[PDB]
Structures are given as C-alpha cells and as structure tokens.
Amino acid sequence: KVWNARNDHLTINQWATRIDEILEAPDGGEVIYNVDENDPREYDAIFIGGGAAGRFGSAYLRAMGGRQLIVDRWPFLGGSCPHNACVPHHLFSDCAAELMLARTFSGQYWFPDMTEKVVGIKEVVDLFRAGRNGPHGIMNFQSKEQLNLEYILNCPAKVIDNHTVEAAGKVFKAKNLILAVGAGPGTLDVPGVNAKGVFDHATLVEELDYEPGSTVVVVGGSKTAVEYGCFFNATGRRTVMLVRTEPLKLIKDNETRAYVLDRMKEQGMEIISGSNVTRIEEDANGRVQAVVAMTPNGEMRIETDFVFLGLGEQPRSAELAKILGLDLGPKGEVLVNEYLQTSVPNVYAVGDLIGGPMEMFKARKSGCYAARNVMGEKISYTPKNYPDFLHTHYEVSFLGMGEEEARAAGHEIVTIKMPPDTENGLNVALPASDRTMLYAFGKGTAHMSGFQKIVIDAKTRKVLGAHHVGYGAKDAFQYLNVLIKQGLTVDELGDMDELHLNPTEFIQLSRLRAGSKNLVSL
Amino acid sequence: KVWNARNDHLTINQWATRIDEILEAPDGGEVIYNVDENDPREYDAIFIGGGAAGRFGSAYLRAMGGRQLIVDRWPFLGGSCPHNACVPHHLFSDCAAELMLARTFSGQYWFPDMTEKVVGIKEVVDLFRAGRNGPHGIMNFQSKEQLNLEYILNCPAKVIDNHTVEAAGKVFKAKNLILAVGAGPGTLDVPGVNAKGVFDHATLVEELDYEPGSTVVVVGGSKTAVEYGCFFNATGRRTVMLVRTEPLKLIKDNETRAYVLDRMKEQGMEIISGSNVTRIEEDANGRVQAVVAMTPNGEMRIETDFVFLGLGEQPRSAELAKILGLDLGPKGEVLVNEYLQTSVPNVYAVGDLIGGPMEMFKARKSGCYAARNVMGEKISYTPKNYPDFLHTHYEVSFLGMGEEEARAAGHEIVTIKMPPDTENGLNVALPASDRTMLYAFGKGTAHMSGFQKIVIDAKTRKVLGAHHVGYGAKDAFQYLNVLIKQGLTVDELGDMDELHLNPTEFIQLSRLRAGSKNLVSL
Ligand SMILES: Cc1cc2c(cc1C)N(C[C@H](O)[C@H](O)[C@H](O)COP(=O)(O)OP(=O)(O)OC[C@H]1O[C@@H](n3cnc4c(N)ncnc43)[C@H](O)[C@@H]1O)c1[nH]c(=O)[nH]c(=O)c1N2
Ligand SMILES: Cc1cc2c(cc1C)N(C[C@H](O)[C@H](O)[C@H](O)COP(=O)(O)OP(=O)(O)OC[C@H]1O[C@@H](n3cnc4c(N)ncnc43)[C@H](O)[C@@H]1O)c1[nH]c(=O)[nH]c(=O)c1N2
Ligand SMILES: O=S(=O)(O)CCS
Ligand SMILES: O=S(=O)(O)CCS
Ligand SMILES: [Mg+2]
Ligand SMILES: [Mg+2]
C-alpha cells in the first residue's frame, strides 16, 4: 500500500521503529509518500536516489527556495552510508583500534587476557544490524521536519524521460532530473565467486549467518578492503590481503606508508602485492573452502571459509543510460561536464554515479552544486586538492604532497616530523596524545605511538603536505587543508595556539624551527 | 660533581637512562653542564627555568642567532609537563576514557566483567613513573643536539642581580634575564592537610606508596580536579568533588556544560557546589580517615583514605621578587607589560609565572615573544581569542561564545548542533564518529555518543563559537579557531571538504543550512 505520511510527524525513534518494521515486512512494506499535494509549483528537480548526494542536493535546493522530490527504493534516506558503508565501517574500525589496544596490553590493568581469544565477527555485525535504524530514523526525521524535503521512499523510481518520473503509481514532471543512484559493489569474474561465504560490504551486513573460521581472505587493497581487513585481523584471525597492485598507494609519502604497512604486518596481517584471484574453491556443501590467486611469487592457495571482496564500486548507470541516452565512461560512470550536466539536456548526475573519487564530500558537494545550477547559478565543481584518510588499526590522514613527491616536483624541502630520525628510531615516547598514551608509556610499545610529518618548501616556507598516523587528527585535517590551500607558512603554523598534548604536533614543532631564516628539518 | 656533557652526544634512550640514574642518586646527582666554552659572546638571555616557556624561548632565541643559557634544578628539560602535569594527566584521561567504555560494555564482546573490578590507581601511577624518563630523554636530546641549546641542569639557579646568575659554582653574566620558574600547587589551610593520603598532582606521582580505598575526595572544580576525579571514578571508586563555587565555569555554553556535568553524574561522580573543606581527619597513624566539609545544606563527613587537591597553581615569585624588586600581582604573579617586561630593567617574565592563562600554548608563546624582544623585536603578546579544552571521561573542546552569552550581547543567532532539539533528546544515534560508535549503537547508550554545537551570527553569517564533547575534535579546534579569527562564515564552512564520519559535523551541517539567505537553526 501507499502510506501518505505528509501530515504525520514521527519522532526520530518512531521513525527508527517504523523503518525497521518496513524493512521486516514480508511483502516488502508500504511506500512512504511524503509529498505536499497542496503546493502548486512545478518541481525544479527530481532526484533519483536519496543517498548523500540526493539528500544534500535536495536540502540545498529547498533552502534556495526551489521545489524538489527525492525518490528512493530504500525506506530510509542517506543511502549506503548508514545502511552498509561509512557507518558500519566506522563501527568496525572502532573495534579494530580498541582490539589492538586490548591485545597489546593483554592481561594488564583492566584488560582481559587476549591470548587465543577470538572475537565474534557475527556478534559485531549483529550489533550493527540491531542499531542501524537509529541513523535511518534521524535521516528521515531531519529531512522531513527540519529540512522541509519531499520524498517517496521504499519505491523504485521509473524514469520515463528527461522531464518525467513515475513513483508510487503516479507521474511527476520536473524541469530537471538529478541522477543520484550511486554505485554497486564490485565483483570478481571467477569460478566460485557466488559460493556461500563470499561477502562484500553490502552482503556482509545482510547475509552473515555463521561465525567465520580462523582465516579470512580479503580481495583488494582499497580503503574498504584495508579497513575491514584490519578489523578481521583484530578479531584474532589470520588475515591475507590479496592486493591487485601496490598496497596503500594512496599514501604518497613513503615513510608514512612504510610505518602504516609495518604496523599492519606487526599485527599479523599478510599483504600480497600484484595478486589476482583465479578461483574460489567450494566444498560439497557449496561454501568457500579456499581461494586460489596468482601472485608475483606464483600460485597461492589459502584455505578459508570466509572471503571479503573490497573491490571498487560500479556506477549504477545501465538502465538510466538506456532510458535517457546517457554518455558513459570506460567504467560505466555517467559523463558530466564541470557543471554536473550529463549528455542529456536538463539531466545532471552526482555522487558515486559519476565515478571517483567516491567520497562523502564529493557526493554531498556535487549534489549541492547540481542544485545551484538547476536554480540558475552557473557554478563549476572539480574535486581537487582535498584531504584524505583511511583506517587500519590506526587513523591515517594525509593531504598535499609526500616528501619524495615534493622533491620530484622541483621543490627544495625540509620536513618536520615525529619521531625524529635517530639511532633509537621509533622506540621513543613521542609522538603522544589522546589514545596513544599507553603505547607511548608501555614496555616495548613506544614504536606504536604514531608517526607524523609536514613537508615544507625551504624557500617560500609554505607547507606542501601533511601526514599523520595515530588518532584524533582526521577532523583537524579538514580545517588544516583549508589553511594550507590559503598559503600556510611554517611561521604562521608556529603562531597558532596549540591544545597540548595534541594529536598533531605541527604547531609547536614549527615554532621550534620558525625563528631561523634558513630552515632546518626537525 | 659537575659533568661536562658539552662534547658528549647521548641518544634519546641513553638520556632517559642517565636522567633516571641522576634522579634516583641519593647524593642528588651530578650537575649536567652543557655550556659552549669557546663562544665569546655575552648571553643575550639567561632563562631561569627550563620548562615549556624557558625551553621554547631558548629555542627561538638561538634560532634567531642569539646566545642563551637555561638553568634548571631538574636534571631534565620540559618542566612540569613531562614530570607531573600535562603528560601524566593525558595518561590518566586515556584510561578514564577507556575505562568508561569498558564499564559501559562490561561482559559484552571482548570486554571483561567490570563488576567487582577496582583498577589499581597505584599500578597506573607506577606505569607513568616507569615511563616518564622517555619524554625526559627526548627533551634533553632535542634541546642539545637539534636545537643547539646551552643548559645547566640538576642545579638551582641563584639570581644575583638583573645581569648576574650563579649556577654550578660559577658566575654568569647576561644582557637580560627571562624568569620562567612556573608555578607550584596551592595548599589548603585546614587541619590534616599534611596527613598521609593527601596528594596533589605533583606529589601523587612521587609519594603514592599504597592503593587507595573505595572512596576518593577531590577538592576543587576546574580542569585538574575534574580530569583526575574522572580518572579516579573510572577506576571504580566513589568520587566526591568538593567545589567552592560551581564546577566547570570555563564551559560557557549552558547546554554543553550541562551535557558534560550530566555524563559525569551518570558515571557516579558526586559534585557538591558551594562547599569548603573544614578538616581532614587523621587516624592514630597519621593517615587520612575522613573529610569534614561545610556545604549549603550544612556540615558533612565523608570517610576516605585518599584526598586529591586540585586547586589553582601559585606563581613561584617570592624569592625572585625579593632579590630583584619585582612588582607582583594580587595572586603573586609577576607583572609584565605586553612585551613580557617586568618592572625591573632587562628582566622579562613568561609562562605560569605571569599567571593565567596557565596553558602550554601561553608559556611557549610568552617565552618565544620575550626572546624576540630581547633580540631587538618589539612584539606585543596578549593572550586572547584562543581555543580551550579539558578532559572528563570525554574530551571537551570550546572556543568563542556560548549560545546564551551571544544572545545576551545583542547578536541575532542561529545554532547548528547535534543531536537536535526534539522529544527524544539525547537518546538518538548521532553525533557519531571514531571512539563513539559503540555508544551510538549500543542498547541504551546512544545519549553517550556526544554533543556539539556552533553559534552563528544570523546577519554576518560568521561563526561566533564552537563547542564539542566527544573524541577527536581537540586537534581540529586549533585550526578551526584560526579560521574563525579570520572571519569564517557558515557558507565557507559548508564549502570545505569533510572527512566523514567526522568528530565535528560542522562542515556538512552548515552546508544543510547555508543555501538560504535567511539562516535557520538545525
Ligand atoms: C564500505 C564503504 C565504506 C565507505 C564508503 C563506501 C563504502 C562502500 N564511502 C563512500 C561513500 O559511501 C559514497 O561515496 C557515498 O555514500 C555515495 O553517495 P551517493 O548518494 O552518490 O550514492 P548512494 O549509493 O549512497 O545513493 C544511491 C541511493 O539511491 C537509491 N537508488 C538506487 N537506484 C534506485 C532506483 N532505481 N530508484 C530509486 N532509488 C534508487 C539507493 O537505494 C540509495 O539509497 C566513504 N566515504 C567517506 O567519505 N568516508 C568513509 O569512511 C567511507 N566509507
Ligand atoms: C595537573 C596539570 C595538568 C595540566 C597542566 C598543569 C597541571 C598542574 N597544564 C598547564 C601547564 O603544565 C603549564 O601551563 C606549563 O607547564 C607551564 O610551563 P612554565 O615553563 O611556565 O612552568 P614550569 O613550572 O613547567 O617550568 C618551571 C621550571 O623551572 C624550574 N625552576 C623553578 N624554580 C627554579 C629555580 N629557582 N632555579 C632553577 N630552576 C627552577 C623547575 O624545576 C621547572 O623545570 C596544562 N596545560 C596545557 O596546555 N594542557 C594540559 O593538558 C595541561 N594539563
Ligand atoms: O550524507 S547523509 O547525511 O545523507 C548520510 C550520512 S550516513
Ligand atoms: O614544552 S616542552 O617541549 O618543553 C615540554 C613538552 S612535554
Ligand atoms: Mg613513538
Ligand atoms: Mg547521541
């Protein structure tokens, strides 16, 4: 049936419960119909998909005084992020970091004895499944009651043409379409890939009905592969990462990458470069029993009953491209100009549908910029020079140039880092800050307290790049990147007010060198 | 004896070991003499004290090409920070944060049963004592080998006059003195204050030779009292805080302060306002057995064998003031103009010695600006418009105006916060980020996932204040404050690249409102 929700006003937690019920419904659940049928204005845009791009684009268009409609096949707004992407990933990475701490200090202070202890993966996935309706509920509530958005949920949109969309058995006209249906999990064209026990980010939180055995094979080297792999390792499982190219290439600074990889290997992870799965072996019960892959050292066969695919996502372009005549790129991404316009008049495309980088900032901003163009503002969007981050068992944050990259680009450079390059190497009690204090003080753990570096042009004194391994700097890199894009010098960094003990020591270490006209690394 | 270390080059860990040896030596240890006997220049400045202010001032003065000498009675540089202040505080706050997590999820997932579990305060203090030599060693190493500093350590300075200081049985002349001896813990004029079992931050890490009983009394209601009190509570002890006025007045936003206090009370802390200790009772062996205090509801007696004094620190000005004739302020602080000059020609004063704000960003800056003035730069310093932070079992970060403060000042304001103002209140699954995911997803724990807010001028669209309770925002507030001092608007905030799931949600929540010319709270 169709639930006309326009004049109902559920709380956040009532929404959480209602969304849970609809997801539970054997028949698939009612359509959530939240349309202002008394507003006579034409729709400025209909958004196909209500994930990060469609939801933020709708919020911005409505804020500018335009009329929008979201259509989404899920009964909640927010798309993959709350249901199977950014949110669960963060729950698992929280677990990975806490578990590394517990295993390092096993049996000390309040920490349990972790020797032999295998943590239940299904237990944590079930926690996520039991709690994910909370964020769903906030999405539906905030969108309807605070952002004044119109939306039809739990209903696939049927695009008829570049001005016409069917939803909930009704036809809606709009001045523009904004295509925001995202991307689907990448898959592997090998025998056995459909065996029971092979999972991706989407299927893991829907179909995990058993506790994995002692070994996990992760396919891929993407952020998702590394984040999930470190969680699986932290639960106590032999974890083999089959990377197609080079592991963690995203970390351009060689010293930072080496520190991160070394810490992963110290936790027991096996990282295989240049590897390609050739077969997933099934046992007679139809479950994965082994993974066979070609590697630089020959064929490798790993016995396992649990495989996690962390491959690149694939834009959901096929049906829309057939209906509308959209020009597509080599990976199936919808091609757009710098105004987010597709090859089809009055059709924009945003978010993961337009390809990399597939990040939340890109999805939300492309949605908003498409909205501004729909509302008559000529505004271009090309994502460039952004900060980035990934989880291992640490938070890893980076922006700008790595040290070698900056030298190769012609810059005379100095660096300011922690710990310093000395005979004792990493085995010193800095850097140290919130959630690295036990590492900094424990017996033999000082090398685990983190790593960080800024790359500086020796003559202009400008900061060219920043790199951090530890905890609590990720949020800072958002604002620091803005400052660096403005032309931040080592002197200006030293002039700031630090909040000691700080995750990034850049401010005070810069101050220690900024008094000299001829800069020297620290 | 006097160890001429000038031409010795110890590693960091060799320094750590040597400092331990000197500290434990019954005779008091050798003097550490690191003076350049070939330099014919007069010292531009002698720094009395080698804490944050003296060490950073020396580093900056040397970097500008001047000559400096540090004299400190400790055998290490860095002052209180590594020995008994910021560093141990952060170790304690880390355990409190980890212990709140463990108690909340006691007996779930990998967490042991925290019922019946009292964590050893002495074990954690002993961990700090065993590891504090690491930072000591880095301080001495970095100062000598990387910063090119001269210093005499493990030797009290005798200031003879405004150009003359004796140290290690030698007389040194200087163009200027920079007084950097810091501040010492305040005391309580009540019977029993010397009883065994009364500690402050300094004596706690030197004299704790027993494991405290089940109750702790903390005297005071600002940063140090609150940070240590939450640690004591997290170890499983009934913790009663006796606050003279009202607690956490530094948190100006009323909702933020209420969230912080509410979460402390939910952990079991008892916060008694308007209370004054009357007596600390000693048993027949000279050990604390109870605290008697007057409260607005009359006298109360609390049985305890452990009292922690978290009173404001007192500038160490008496001896120097009498020697030099320094003008002092009402709190014993040394009075300085905006160039850090005392009333005595060629004598500057810096750090905690000059009073509030007693922070690591103040002492460092003050000492650096004093150095620059000594070297011929007329540069003023008045600490103002800076971010601030404290620990409870959370990290608490704040800058600028609270909401009520801004409205009382005539500003038309909007606020953008998380969680929203609704019937469900805090009992919703946002805000959520690293180290709050378990709270956001746990049964009955969502209200523990944090609280955050920005205060915005509705007409200029400028951010007037920002407030956050959670984890991983402290470092960001350093750089966010700089942007706000430049004139940050909600539109510019919305234009940034966020790194989802971010500790501060200010970027994307701003984006949700910035599309309207008439701003609306969220
Ligand atoms: C495992 C994992 C982990 C992360 C991330 C991804 C993944 C897979 N990401 C990336 C992030 O999730 C991604 O960039 C955005 O969610 C994409 O938002 P979109 O709205 O463009 O797509 P998204 O796919 O979210 O939106 C599509 C929406 O449209 C709906 N839809 C599809 N077809 C439809 C149809 N025919 N009719 C109606 N509705 C339809 C879908 O149901 C969905 O609601 C991330 N990013 C980041 O910044 N930080 C991070 O930590 C992570 N972590
Ligand atoms: C418990 C606790 C916790 C914190 C903090 C304080 C306390 C008590 N602080 C405050 C911070 O510690 C403080 O602002 C600085 O350490 C002050 O540095 P100074 O160099 O000014 O004094 P400090 O006292 O550190 O330096 C004095 C030095 O001079 C020496 N000296 C003294 N008299 C001498 C004499 N006659 N002859 C020779 N040498 C002499 C001393 O031995 C010492 O080495 C803080 N700040 C912050 O930013 N973040 C935080 O988290 C905390 N946390
Ligand atoms: O970007 S959205 O707020 O829509 C989803 C956050 S998980
Ligand atoms: O500020 S100092 O570098 O001197 C001490 C930091 S622990
Ligand atoms: Mg280290
Ligand atoms: Mg909450």
Q: How far is B63 from chain A (nearest CA, A)?
A: 5
Q: What is the number of helices (H) and of strands (E) in chain A?
A: 16, 25
* CA–CA dist B92, B234 (Å, integer): 10
Residue A126: left (phi > 0), alpha (psi -120 to 50), or beta? alpha
Helix (H, G, I), strand (E, B) or coil at B142: helix
Answer yes or no: is the C-beta of A359 below 6 A from any ligand 1 atom: yes
Going by DSSP bridges, is the β-strand pair A215-219/A413-418 parallel, antiparallel, or unpaired? unpaired
In the chain, the amino acid numbered B476 is A
The answer for residues whose C-beta is within 8 angstroms of residue B26's C-beta and 6 or more apart is: none
C-alpha to C-alpha distance for A384 and B455, rounded to whole angstroms: 30
Separation of B519 CA from ligand 6 center, angstroms? 24
What is d(CA B446, CA A131) in angstroms, rounded to the nearest whole number? Answer: 10
**Percentages helix, strand, coil for chain B, rounded to the nearest 5?**
35, 25, 45
Instruction: Report the SS3 class of residue B311.
Output: coil
**Optimal mutation site among B390, B441, B481, B498, interface A, most CBs of chain A within 10 A:** B441
The partner residue sitting opposite A138, judged by closest CB among B134, B429, B480, is B429
C-beta atoms of A397 and B61 within 8 A? no
Size of interface A-B (CB pairs under 8 A): 322
Chain-centroid distance of CA B451 in Å reads 22
CA–CA dist B435, B97 (Å, integer): 9
Ramachandran area for residue A7 (φ above 0: left; ψ -120 to 50: alpha; else beta): alpha
Ligand 1 atom closest to residue A80's alpha carbon, by position in its atom list: 25
The answer to whether A437 contacts B386, with C-beta atoms less than 8 Å apart, is: no
> Three-state SS for B491?
helix
Q: Is B131 helix (H, G, I), strand (E, B) or coil?
A: helix
Q: Across-strand partners of A172?
A: A165
Measure Cα distances from A201 to A16, A311, A429, B100 in Å: 22, 10, 37, 30
**Contact B87/A124, CB-based, under 8 Å?**
no
First to last CA, chain A: 67
What is d(CA B484, CA B489) in angstroms, rounded to the nearest whole number?
A: 8
- In terms of Cβ atoms closer than 10 Å to its own Cβ (0-12, 13-18, 19+), residue B28 is exposed
CB of residue A20 inside a 6 A radius of ligand 1: no
Taking a C-beta distance cutoff of 8 angstroms, is the pair A456, A477 a contact?
A: no
> Please, which residues have CB within 8 angstroms of residue A260's CB and are 6 or more apart in sequence?
A248, A251, A392, A394, A396, A469
Bond into B501 cis (ω within 30): yes
CB neighbour list of residue A330: distance below 8 Å, 6 or more residues apart: none
3-state helix, strand, coil in chain A (%, to 5): 35, 25, 45
Q: Is B346 exposed, middle or buried (0-12, 13-18, 19+ CB in 10 A)?
A: middle
**Beta pairing partners, A13:** none
How near does any CA of chain A get to the CA of B406, in Å?
23
Helices B52-63 and A506-513: angle between axes, nearest 10 degrees? 40
Task: Return the domain boundaries, chain A.
Answer: 1-84+131-185+313-377, 86-130+196-243+269-310, 253-267+385-522
Distance between CA atoms of B331 and B310, rounded to whole angstroms?
Answer: 17
Contacts of B480 (CB under 8 A, 6+ apart): A479, B387, B399, B466, B488, B504, B506
Q: Tell me the three-class secondary structure of B370-417, residue by residue.
A: HHHHHCCCCCCCCCCCCCEEEECCCEEEEEECCHHHHHHCCCCEEEEE
Q: Do B437 and A387 touch (CB under 8 A)?
A: no
Q: Which two tokens stand for residue A261?
A: 């990889």
> Which residues does a chain break follow in chain B (C to N more than 2.5 Å)?
none
Q: Please answer yes or no on whether A429 and B146 come within 8 Å at the CB atom.
A: no
Residue of A nearest to B114 (CA): A110
Chain B residues in contact with A147 by the CB 8 A cut-off are: 512
How far is Cα A111 from Cα B102, in angstroms, rounded to an integer? Answer: 9
Q: Which residues contact B370 (CB under 8 A, 6 or more apart)?
A: B45, B57, B178, B339, B340, B348, B349, B350
Residue (of B40, B333, B90) closest to B227 by Cα position: B90
B295 - beta bridge partners?
B298
- Helices A52-63 and A360-374: crossing angle in degrees, nearest 10, is 40
Report H helices in B197-308: 201-207, 223-234, 254-266
Half-sphere exposure of B60 (CA within 13 A, CB side): 28
What is the chain A residue with the closest CA to B511? A60
- Separation CA A205–CA A208 (nearest Å): 7
Q: Is B316 in the pocket of ligand 2 (CB under 6 A)?
A: yes
Distance set, CA A334 to CA A81, A360, B122, B454 (Å): 21, 18, 62, 37
Residues, chain A:
522
3-state secondary structure of B230: helix
In angstroms, rounded to a whole number, what is the distance separating the alpha carbons of residues A154 and A172?
Answer: 17
Report which residue type is found at A391: H
**Ligand nearest the Cα atom of residue A228:** 1
Give strand ranges (E) for B210-296: 215-219, 238-242, 270-272, 276-282, 288-295
Measuring CA to CA, which residue among B421, B463, B492, B502 is closest to residue A388?
Answer: B502
Using CB atoms, pick whichever of B56, B94, B359 lies closest to residue A434. B94
The count of C-alpha atoms lying within 13 angstroms of the C-alpha of A519, restricted to the half-sphere facing its C-beta, is: 23
B469 closest CA partner among B264, B266, B267, B271: B264
Indicate the residue of B59, B479, B515 with minimum beta-carbon distance to A480. Answer: B479
Crossing angle for the helix pair A12-24 and A133-141, to the nearest 10 degrees? 120
The 3 state secondary structure assigned to A296-364 is CCEEEEEECCCEEECCCCEECCHHHHHHHCCCECCCCCECCCCCCECCCCCEEECHHHHCCCCCHHHHH
Closest CA to A371 of A96, A83, A64: A64
Q: How far apart are alpha carbons B10 and B141 in whole angstroms?
A: 7
Method: X-ray
CB A139 within 8 A of CB A26: no
CB of A388 shorter than 6 A to ligand 1: no
Bridge partners of residue A288, in order along the sequence: A282
**B159 CA → ligand 2 middle, Å:** 20
Q: Which residues contact B284 (CB under 8 A, 6 or more apart)?
A: none
Q: Which residue has the tokens 């890109």?
A: A362
Provide the shortest C-alpha distance from residue B253 to chain A (in Å): 19
| Geometric angle at alpha carbon B44, from B41 and B50, rounded to 5° | 115
Buried b (16+ CB within 10 A) or exposed e, A464-480: bbbbbbbbbbbbbbbbb
Q: Is the bond leading into A357 cis (omega within 30 degrees of zero)?
A: yes
Q: Which two tokens stand for residue A384?
A: 């460039």
Residue pointed to by tokens 């922070």: B359
Concatenate the DSSP letters of all residues of B6-66 into one string. TT----HHHHHHHHHHHHH-TT---EEEE--TT--SPBSEEEE--BHHHHHHHHHHHHTT-
Interval between CA A342 and ligand 3 midpoint (Å) = 24
How many residues comprise chain B?
A: 522
Residue B65 CA, distance from chain mean position: 31
Asked whether the beta carbons of residue A141 and residue B93 sit closer than 8 angstroms, the reply is no
**Does ligand 4 come within 6 angstroms of the Cβ of B55?**
yes
Among protein residues, the one whose CA lies closest to atom 7 of ligand 2: B85
Integer Cα distance of A172 and A192 in angstroms? 44
Closest by CA position to A453, among listed A510, A415, A411, A407: A415
A475, A506, A517: best mutation site toward chain B, by most B Cβ within 10 Å?
A475
Q: Is B85 in the pocket of ligand 2 (CB under 6 A)?
A: yes
Cβ–Cβ < 8 Å for B500, A55: no
Burial class of A99 by CB neighbour count within 10 A (0 to 12, 13 to 18, 19+): buried
Residue B215: count of CB within 10 angstroms of its CB: 18
Is residue B53 lining ligand 2, measured as CB closer than 6 Å?
yes
Determine phi and psi for B29, rounding to 5 degrees.
95, 155
CB pair distance less than 8 Å for A474 and B138:
no
- Distance in angstroms (rounded) separating the CA atoms of residues B119 and A519: 48
**Contact state of B97 with A56 under an 8 Å Cβ cutoff:** no
> Residue A497 CA: which ligand is closest?
2
Distance CA B384, CA A497 (A): 10
Query: Residue A493 has which token pair?
Result: 């960094």
Question: Which candidate, B94, B435, B87, B434, places its Cα nearest to that of A434?
Answer: B94
CA-to-CA distance for A323 and A191, rounded, in angstroms? 32
Beta bridge partners of A287: A196
3-state secondary structure B417-463: EECCCCCCCCCCCCCCCCCCHHHHHCCCCHHHHCEEEEEEECCCCEE
Contacts of A90 in chain B (CB under 8 A): 432-434, 437, 501
User: Whose alpha carbon is nearest atom 18 of ligand 2?
Assistant: B52
Q: Rg (Cα) of chain B, in Å, rounded?
A: 25
Distance CA A335, CA A316 (A): 13
Query: Which of A32, A19, A75, A51 lies closest to B429 in space, CA to CA?
Result: A19
Strand partners, A432: none
Instruction: Looking at B200-325, list the stretches that DSSP marks H as alpha helix, in order from N- to C-terminal side.
Output: 201-207, 223-234, 254-266, 318-324
Q: Choose from B492, B497, B522 for mutation: most chain A CBs within 10 A.
A: B497
Give A87's DSSP letter: H
